[PDB]
Amino acid sequence: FTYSYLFRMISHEMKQKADQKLEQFDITNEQGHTLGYLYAHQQDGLTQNDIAKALQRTGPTVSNLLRNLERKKLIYRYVDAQRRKNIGLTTSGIKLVEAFTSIFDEMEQTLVSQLSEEENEQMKANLTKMLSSLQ
Amino acid sequence: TYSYLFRMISHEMKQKADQKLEQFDITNEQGHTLGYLYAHQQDGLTQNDIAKALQRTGPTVSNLLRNLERKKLIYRYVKNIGLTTSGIKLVEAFTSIFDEMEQTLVSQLSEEENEQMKANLTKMLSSLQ
Known part of the structure; x- marks a missing residue:
């Protein structure tokens, strides 16, 4: 009945549905944000x-995710000419995204x-007003 | 889009909650401990x-409890x-x-x-199952 319960249940359910969709491409939620x-x-x-950084996760966590994406050849990597x-x-990575x-x-x-x-x-309009009142 | 709006709002709701909580001079972690x-x-x-219940290390909890005890929100016995x-009243x-906030x-x-x-949010929530 509360807006707090409604807003959070929807967000939760939306993420659950989206991840449900991404798994048909065998991609997790985080793999999805990385690719995007x-x-x-x-x-x-x-x-x-x-x-x-942008993902707000640890290097070793990110490293392992890039490796997984890497084995599928959805990404590749080259050393910068200007130690990184x-x-x-x-x-195929672009086509998947x-x-x-x-x-x-x-879904929208x-x-x-x-x-x-x-x-x-x-x-x-109402969702907007409420989004402002909190900001 | 609805996706954007619903995510931003949930983000701000969360912060608002913490902001009010800080009005009692209580952090999120401190709030969970008391609770x-x-x-x-x-x-x-x-x-x-x-x-163990909080999934935090010994020093973190030790620090939390010390902060809380100095306010007499908690006490300890052998x-x-x-x-x-006052701790119960605060919680x-x-x-x-x-x-x-509601x-x-x-x-x-x-x-x-x-x-x-x-009513519309309830409908949208249902379509989402």
């Missing part, structure tokens, strides 16, 4: 350390199709 | 008991750790944080906007 992160910043060169290893997405990026859009549409046009509009 | 003691006092807890009356007071949000919308808002 690389897809959004492959323009200049990311190091294992950059990923660990840059990580890059492979073509594009494939499950469409699934997330699909399913949620929307749950309310009428007017209800969606009001819901979005 | 743990509040619900598991009946038999007598040692630092070890607290550390060593079991117990919650004092009960934590409830106002959830209530205050009302602050509610007061953002009209009475009907709230019923609509809550």
